[PDB]
Amino acid sequence: LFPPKPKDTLMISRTPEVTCVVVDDPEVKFNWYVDGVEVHNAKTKPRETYRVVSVLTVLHQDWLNGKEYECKVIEKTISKAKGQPREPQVYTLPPSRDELTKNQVSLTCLVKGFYPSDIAVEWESNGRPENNYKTTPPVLDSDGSFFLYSKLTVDKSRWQQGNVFSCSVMHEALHNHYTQKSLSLS
Amino acid sequence: PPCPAPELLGGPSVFLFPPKPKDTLMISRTPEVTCVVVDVSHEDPEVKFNWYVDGVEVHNAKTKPREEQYNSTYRVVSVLTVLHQDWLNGKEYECKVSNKALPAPIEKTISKAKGQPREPQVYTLPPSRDELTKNQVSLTCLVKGFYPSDIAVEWESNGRPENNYKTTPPVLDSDGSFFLYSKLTVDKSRWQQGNVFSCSVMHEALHNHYTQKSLSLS
Numbered sequence: 001l002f003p004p005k006p007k008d009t010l011m012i013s014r015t016p017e018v019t020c021v022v023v024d025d026p027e028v029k030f031n032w033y034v035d036g037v038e039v040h041n042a043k044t045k046p047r048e049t050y051r052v053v054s055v056l057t058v059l060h061q062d063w064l065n066g067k068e069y070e071c072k073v074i075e076k077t078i079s080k081a082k083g084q085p086r087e088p089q090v091y092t093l094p095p096s097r098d099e100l101t102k103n104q105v106s107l108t109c110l111v112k113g114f115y116p117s118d119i120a121v122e123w124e125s126n127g128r129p130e131n132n133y134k135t136t137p138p139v140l141d142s143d144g145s146f147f148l149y150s151k152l153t154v155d156k157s158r159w160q161q162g163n164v165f166s167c168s169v170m171h172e173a174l175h176n177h178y179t180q181k182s183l184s185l186s
Numbered sequence: 187p188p189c190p191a192p193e194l195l196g197g198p199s200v201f202l203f204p205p206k207p208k209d210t211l212m213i214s215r216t217p218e219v220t221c222v223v224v225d226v227s228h229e230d231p232e233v234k235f236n237w238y239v240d241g242v243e244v245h246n247a248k249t250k251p252r253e254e255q256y257n258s259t260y261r262v263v264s265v266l267t268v269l270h271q272d273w274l275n276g277k278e279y280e281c282k283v284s285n286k287a288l289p290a291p292i293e294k295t296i297s298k299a300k301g302q303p304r305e306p307q308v309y310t311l312p313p314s315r316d317e318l319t320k321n322q323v324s325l326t327c328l329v330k331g332f333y334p335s336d337i338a339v340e341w342e343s344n345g346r347p348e349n350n351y352k353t354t355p356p357v358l359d360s361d362g363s364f365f366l367y368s369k370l371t372v373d374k375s376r377w378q379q380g381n382v383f384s385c386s387v388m389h390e391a392l393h394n395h396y397t398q399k400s401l402s403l404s
């Protein structure tokens with residue numbers, strides 16, 4: 001079993017789903033038990049050795065409250081990490097002086113000290129999303145928490161102006177499951 | 187009432203491993219291609235290694251002693267020392283293992299990433315204006331636009347290495363290259379005292395396979 005994408009579980013915009021994957025007789029049996037009670041609102045994807053995948057749509061309040069989901073083929077149970085939540089520290093980093101010589105600069109967002117690793121980072125400017133950005137996977141730090149970096153690449157002309165860029169971070173331990181930190185030239 | 191011997195119904199598995207990226211780029215270390223054979227049946231423990239470098243057989247390998255694991259099985263490792271020039275040019279290395287418990291000999295091959303190299307751009311980033319409140323500040327090193335992913339990152343201060351750092355794995359960027367970050371955590375007192383820290387990056391596409399960028403308080 002595989003957990004849903006952290007944004008699907010922390011944002012009401014996308015529908016989260018728990019995915020059961022079987023790799024390596026094409027008849028298979030999937031029995032989904034949500035918190036003990038058997039549910040029959042799951043759909044199994046077509047097969048394609050062959051691999052059969054079963055998907056059960058979960059509710060945002062259901063997953064975020066840590067209710068357990070069981071896939072019965074083999075019996076596997078998955079849920080949110082039971083560790084004590086830690087609030088992410090969000091800091092923005094301007095491009096280096098040595099990078100200003102190039103035509104595009106890299107705006108850096110450090111998101112440190114959060115738990116669990118389930119998180120989602122996005123970049124936005126003037127209310128519109130940004131296209132050219134990538135974010136590292138969460139990295140286990142020394143104190144048992146997690147950190148990551150998010151790199152937004154914009155044209156230097158936008159940075160050379162007074163344009164304002166903001167780092168959007170979404171974590172379970174955040175107020176309203178959402179926070180922002182801005183970054184601009186001055 | 188002791189249970190009987192383990193079943194071990196199957197065959198020995200083999201896993202080939204490339205040399206460490208640091209050893210392949212620094213003249214102070216010896217790079218090795220490692221051929222590990224696991225699940226060696228105790229009834230038939232003899233293993234035979236045939237090393238092939240791009241087709242031509244090599245006979246300059248060393249085999250480490252057997253190691254019996256907690257699951258009562260053996261582990262036979264054979265190591266082949268490689269030349270820095272040969273690995274960096276993309277030479278293929280083939281390990282051929284032969285055992286009585288294997289129906290046909292298992293063969294694995296490892297080599298350097300074949301793409302057109304890209305030179306990394308290294309930038310150091312000082313702690314954020316908000317982070318100076320804490321007793322420890324984060325020193326950030328951005329390494330972007332390099333291919334292949336095999337790379338080595340370290341930190342250093344006053345000619346001595348800095349150990350308390352963490353580096354993210356390589357992340358595929360939009361242009362087919364890679365980027366990553368390395369976070370060095372130091373006491374705000376050391377950062378305020380004007381000490382100079384350095385991010386050292388080791389990549390095959392760099393000049394002399396090495397570069398440094400320093401960082402100090404303004």
Ligand SMILES: *[C@@H]1O[C@H](CO[C@@H]2O[C@@H](C)[C@@H](O)[C@@H](O)[C@@H]2O)[C@@H](O[C@@H]2O[C@H](CO)[C@@H](O[C@@H]3O[C@H](CO[C@H]4O[C@H](CO)[C@@H](O)[C@H](O)[C@@H]4O[C@@H]4O[C@H](CO)[C@@H](O)[C@H](O)[C@H]4NC(C)=O)[C@@H](O)[C@H](O[C@H]4O[C@H](CO)[C@@H](O)[C@H](O)[C@@H]4O[C@@H]4O[C@H](CO)[C@@H](O)[C@H](O)[C@H]4NC(C)=O)[C@@H]3O)[C@H](O)[C@H]2NC(C)=O)[C@H](O)[C@H]1NC(C)=O
Nearest residue numbers: 194199201203204206220222224225255256257259261263
């Ligand atoms: C009996 O037990 C032993 C060992 O267990 C020991 O005792 C128990 C009690 C525990 O305490 C264990 O911790 C302890 O080790 C069993 O032997 C194990 O067998 C499994 C597989 O059955 C092996 O897993 C493989 O792991 C490799 C990478 O492993 C690294 O990390 C290990 C620690 O996590 C470390 O011990 C390894 O040595 C190795 O670390 C490397 O070490 C070398 C030193 O020689 C060093 O040079 C390297 O730098 C270093 N590297 C790193 C990163 O640390 C993993 O890569 C394998 O996965 C491949 O294969 C899978 C298919 O089985 C697949 O699912 C994976 O995705 C991956 O797929 C491959 O990907 C490559 C990528 O290019 C691709 O080319 C391939 O085509 C693709 N497919 C294949 C088939 O390769 C794999 O998971 C353990 O390493 C091994 N432990 C050993 C040898 O110590 C034994 O099986 C048990 N037997 C029984 C009967 O129970």
Ligand SMILES: [K+]
Nearest residue numbers: 213269270271
């Ligand atoms: K040499």
